Amino acid sequence: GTPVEVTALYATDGCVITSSIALLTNSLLGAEPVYIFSY
Structure with a gap:
């Protein structure tokens, strides 16, 4: 269909x-x- 928009808050060890x-x-x-x- 149509692309789903996602906003992902990300983190990393370091x-x-x-x-x-x-x-x-x-x-x-x-x-x-x-x-x-979170997303």
Whole structure:
């Protein structure tokens, strides 16, 4: 049908900003699993 829109508030064990930046830059050295606390 049509895509369902989801807003996910997420967290990580460690520095969330550093992990997000590593994910965005494709530099897979600081990326860690993301836990979706709320949606």
